[PDB]
Design a protein around this ligand. Sequence first.
Ligand SMILES: CC(C)CCC[C@@H](C)[C@H]1CC[C@H]2[C@@H]3CC=C4C[C@@H](OC(=O)CCC(=O)O)CC[C@]4(C)[C@H]3CC[C@]12C
Ligand SMILES: CC(C)CCC[C@@H](C)[C@H]1CC[C@H]2[C@@H]3CC=C4C[C@@H](OC(=O)CCC(=O)O)CC[C@]4(C)[C@H]3CC[C@]12C
Lengths: 178, 178, 211, 211
Amino acid sequence: TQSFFMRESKTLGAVQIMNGLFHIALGGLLMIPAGIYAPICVTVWYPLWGGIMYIISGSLLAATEKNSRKCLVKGKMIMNSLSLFAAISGMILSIMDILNIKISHFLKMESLNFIRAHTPYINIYNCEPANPSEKNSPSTQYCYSIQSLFLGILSVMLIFAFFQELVIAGIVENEWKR
Amino acid sequence: TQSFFMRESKTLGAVQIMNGLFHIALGGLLMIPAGIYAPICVTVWYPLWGGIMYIISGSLLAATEKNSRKCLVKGKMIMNSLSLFAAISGMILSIMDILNIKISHFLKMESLNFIRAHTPYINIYNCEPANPSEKNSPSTQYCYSIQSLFLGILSVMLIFAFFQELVIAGIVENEWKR
Amino acid sequence: EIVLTQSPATLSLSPGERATLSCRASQSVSSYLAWYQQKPGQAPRLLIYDASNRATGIPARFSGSGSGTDFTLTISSLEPEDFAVYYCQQRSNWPITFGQGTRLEIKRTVAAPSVFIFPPSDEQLKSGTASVVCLLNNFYPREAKVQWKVDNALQSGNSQESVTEQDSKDSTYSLSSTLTLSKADYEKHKVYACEVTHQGLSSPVTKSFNR
Amino acid sequence: EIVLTQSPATLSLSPGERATLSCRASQSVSSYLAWYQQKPGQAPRLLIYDASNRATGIPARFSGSGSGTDFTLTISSLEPEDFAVYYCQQRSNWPITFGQGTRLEIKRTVAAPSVFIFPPSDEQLKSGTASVVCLLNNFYPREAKVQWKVDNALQSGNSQESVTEQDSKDSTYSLSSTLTLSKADYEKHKVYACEVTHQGLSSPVTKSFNR
Ligand SMILES: CC(C)CCC[C@@H](C)[C@H]1CC[C@H]2[C@@H]3CC=C4C[C@@H](OC(=O)CCC(=O)O)CC[C@]4(C)[C@H]3CC[C@]12C
Ligand SMILES: CC(C)CCC[C@@H](C)[C@H]1CC[C@H]2[C@@H]3CC=C4C[C@@H](OC(=O)CCC(=O)O)CC[C@]4(C)[C@H]3CC[C@]12C
């Protein structure tokens, strides 16, 4: 409840633009052709409007001093509330797709046809050799490698999304005393 | 040559701590077991160098106001010089690994033994069916996902290293007029 | 490669509660197994897989588990549709090997068998063959010792016989020994007879007819 | 599946500059090809691959390219170690098919052949066989028409012959027709002779001996 960040709030909104840039860059980098059943990050298009929202929030603090009325003094509340809502949706999707990977199939999430035709003869959710022998096969090894890579990138996205939500929650609790 | 960032340089150094955080996070993420011959960035341990050099600079710019002597005012030139040299090496290695990936073998960069035992049976530099037929086989068309992932990781690494070098060059040029 | 051995079939199961069999293997198979239920007249049905999970969509009162080379399964409920063959398989190394089959019985009391004779007919012999049939019915169990003798002499490698199924009322077994015989051998032989022995008779009995 | 046909061998190559052969295929093969150099007495050596890149570590004065079904290669330099067989292969679809072989010659002038006779020996006939040899030497080219007649009668399917290599001085070919013959047939026959024809003779010549 200690107020010590209001006077040094120039950087808090200054970093958000490049936070959104990083988020949208990661979302774009995650759009590599993988297989048939794309993850939940595809069917919702969350990274696109999430990064747009973050960069708009960062650019909102371009002029902290009072310049105009009803545009730089009234939007500060709706914008932070919607940013917090986007953040909580971010945690919901992140926890769901971090819990659904180590357990069996839950939902479908079909990928679009333009990228599906590139790699239509493989699956990403499960790959079993269907034989107790030949366990030391390149197919299973490559599956384990790519699954570990996907898990790592998802964990990285989780950690930085959580940090972004923490700073957004701090900045939104700065304005109002509940 | 127009000096307009000196008075508002707090953000420029503020973003550097978490830029180094991004650098070290990417370095840790890229260290998943992937193939037999590790890339050049593995044996050089560059991400640790970049992260440490960036975080120590961020710690240096914690207090801009004159507080002590010979510690917060003398190292501002050695720090900038070492950061610039580290960035120079950064994009030198970046261009090296982005040029050696589409051309034939140049060097080996043999990986360490602890990761060696886990992934013995797959190559990362080149996968070929070794047969003119069976082109539409998983073992042939099922490398391009990680190929594009590595290409994108290297590209974003190069872009962010270039941006960091640009901002550091601007900062050091602000200090001294050449 | 891998060969599977099964418990002996035709197990005498009184109408009680206990029912247990086994399926062993020579080489140490993996932990996971598979048991299936086979019924005649239509497609078979799944029974249990991995010896740790129940059936999907079918209620299962069975209890089967085990590890290594010895496995035990037991069923306590008595339903009128469980009397069928049992198959055990393995999936340790390709190619896989299948079992032979164990069929359960109903514990029916023994019945006194009967005999009959039938000399060859004129139309039968005019075709170029002569067959004599001895009818066996109302006997238990299906195992029996029936042979043929001609002129007090023993012949082998000439009899083909098939068994019947069990009725839904009394589960009565029937048999009919039939041998195709040549005309030339039929002409030069005098005495034809068939002999049957069973637990229901204290002394062998034979029937003879005049040609 | 894929079958490869080659240009006819024994091509007459005068000591000039031009030297060209071909290797065709029935089905349309892929663009990439492979040509190899084979030498007798030791391991062969690479010649050219993909019809677009030179040899690795070996200087190459050759010029071979082509596409589709027709391919052309030409060599202008004349070295004393290029006289060998040529092999063409393909790698379009498994299994691969190999060629037969084309060997180049030296353009040696024709030489007059000679003939000889040799009656069977006492030690030879005592073993249980009798062979007569007609020696052929100093003839060009290797192709020749030699046959045997006994008592002015023609026999077939009894002659086995092998050819020799070429010397490093004059490249002279030699032949020696030898047929193993039974004693019983040797006793009852009168006249043995062998006949040879060639471009160097204007009329067939034969030699006979008294038994
Ligand atoms: C605003 C943008 C920057 C957000 C990020 C979008 C990219 C992550 C996606 C959008 C379309 C995708 C592209 C769609 C198609 C291809 C074709 C693909 O090569 C092909 O398949 C050739 C075309 C064919 O053979 O059909 C290379 C990847 C690429 C460029 C994809 C790369 C990733 C792209 C650019
Ligand atoms: C906030 C944004 C503007 C920062 C920049 C992000 C993108 C504009 C850049 C970053 C890395 C670039 C990617 C680097 C590598 C590739 C690989 C490339 O793959 C191929 O074309 C080869 C296909 C194959 O044959 O495998 C597709 C484009 C892509 C994703 C590039 C798309 C554009 C990306 C995502």
